Amino acid sequence: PLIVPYNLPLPGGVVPRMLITILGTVKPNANRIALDFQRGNDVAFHFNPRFNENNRRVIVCNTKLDNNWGREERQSVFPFESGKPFKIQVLVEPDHFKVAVNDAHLLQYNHRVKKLNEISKLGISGDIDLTSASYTMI
């Protein structure tokens, strides 16, 4: 177990077939979670569960380039619950990031940042108890 916020290095960046697993528990009164796949100051992929945006639960995904957020991709399917243990898996594929939560497919996010081998850090933040963050190649 680790204290959030936490940076996981991705040395040499990411590559297709790399599977990143984040295990934790959502805090009881959670408002937000974020994963930030970083290329320097750019965020190639921001994955952001919001537990109370205008009293709805939503997943927001985006990219930050030159310190500016781009066009959001939103999903209403919301597999997290306050207080419960979760597993987020991010599978890097040639054209997208694929996300599964608790072994169920959630979403795809097309690569906007093309330099996968420069996406060299994963920041983990928000209302969680972080158990582990690791990766392997499938």
Ligand SMILES: CO[C@@H]1[C@@H](n2cc(-c3cc(F)c(F)c(F)c3)nn2)[C@@H](O)[C@@H](CO)O[C@H]1C(=O)N(c1cc(Cl)cc(Cl)c1)[C@H]1CCCC[C@@H]1O
């Ligand atoms: C709060 O800002 C968020 C960003 N955001 C979150 C976090 C964060 C930090 C943590 F430490 C953490 F633990 C955590 F879980 C999340 N950091 N940064 C991204 O989450 C971004 C992702 O697009 O959104 C921002 C956003 O809230 N807006 C927005 C604003 C602009 Cl300037 C530009 C666009 Cl494009 C959006 C909203 C505007 C009003 C209509 C809705 C819109 O969604």
